[PDB]
Every structure is written in structure tokens, then in C-alpha cells.
Amino acid sequence: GEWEIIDIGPFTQNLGKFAVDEENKIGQYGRLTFNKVIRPCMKKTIYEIKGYEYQLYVYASDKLFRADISEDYKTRGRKLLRFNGPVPPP
Amino acid sequence: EWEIIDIGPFTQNLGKFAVDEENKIGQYGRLTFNKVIRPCMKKTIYEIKGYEYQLYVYASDKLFRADISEDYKTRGRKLLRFNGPVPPP
């Protein structure tokens, strides 16, 4: 799915040390001394839209072509991937 | 993952862009755009942005709940929340 349970090895423990260190920067508690991270540890893989791809039946010089275009999400920057033809009508 | 969109002005505008970019390379002589017809397909491309972690961490022998965000591209980490003390899982 999008959520995953990971193990409590060095990488996970190091996350724990990071939490405590950043918490001491704020100070909502007393200076904290890192002990250990215990199970369970949850990992959420965050997905984001990069861009889009379009498939298009397009007439040019009275010839049927199949054109594909990629568009970026943030910038709407467009690019032509492929342009083949003539091809048969749907 | 695949989606059908109508052949309205926006779609036609994609057609105008495809022909124009083809003229720049030129693998089909000078072409003149006419129109785009059905069906038009749209595939939405997703990419990993980062990660969020839920931790049970002992600090000064108290059990806290910590949430940390980690970015995919930059490896940048941030502490989102830090509550406690909390009961053992």
C-alpha cells in the first residue's frame, strides 16, 4: 500500500536520535537523552504528480498522425515524445 | 491510470503544439495542423516526493510519539510532531 512497517535497525534508531535532537532545539520538554526506538515503526511513501502524458489523434497536412506529449505539473512545460504516421483511423 | 478527455480547445491546443514541434525537427516536411479527433487519452505520471515516519522513541525513559518527514530528492528531514508521554504499544 502506501504505508509500510519497517524494522528497528540502525537507520530507524538514527531517526529516533534525530527526533530527540530536533525536540531539544524546541524545548517543549527537558533536555532529552536518547534511549531507544521501539516497534512499531511506520513508513509512508509520499507520492506526487510529476507531469502528464497525452496521446493524440491529430490531422496534419491531411495525414493522420499519432502524437505524444509530456507536460510538467509545476511548470506546464511541454515536450513532444513521438510523432509517427500516417496511421489508420480509430 | 489512463483517462479519456474531450477534444475541446485545450486538447486542440495540444495538437497545435505537436505539429509545431515536429516542424522544428522536420521529419515530415512542413506540416499544417488541421484538427485533433477522439479519442484523446491522458496518463497521469506520479513520482515519489518524500517519506513520513512514525516513531515510538524513549527519551529520558519516557515514551514519546514522533513524526518525521524526509524528502526524496534532497534527503532533507524535519520533525513534524512530538507528543508524550504515551502508553506502550
Structure notes:
Two copies of one chain form a homodimer. By secondary structure, chain A is an alpha+beta fold. Chain A has two domains: 1-46, Helix Hairpins (Helix non-globular); 47-90, N-terminal domain of TfIIb (Other non-globular), CATH 6.20.50.130. Chain A is 19% helix and 53% strand. Chain A is built from one helix and four strands; from the N terminus they run E-H-E-E-E. Chain A has one helix at residues 10-26; strands spanning 3-6, 34-60, 63-72, 78-84. A four-stranded antiparallel sheet of chain A has the order 1-2-3-4. Chain A is elongated. The two termini of chain A are 37 Å apart. The interface between A and B is large, with 54 and 55 residues. The PDB classes it as plant protein. Keywords: domain swapped dimer, Single-chain Monellin, hinge loop composition, loop deletion, plant protein. The assembly is dimeric. Domain swapped dimer crystal structure of loop1 deletion mutant in Single-chain Monellin. Chains A, B are Monellin chain B,Monellin chain A.
Task: Give a summary of the structure in a few sentences.
The structure is a homodimer. The first copy, chain A, has 90 residues and is of the alpha+beta class. In chain A, 19% of the residues lie in helices and 53% in strands.
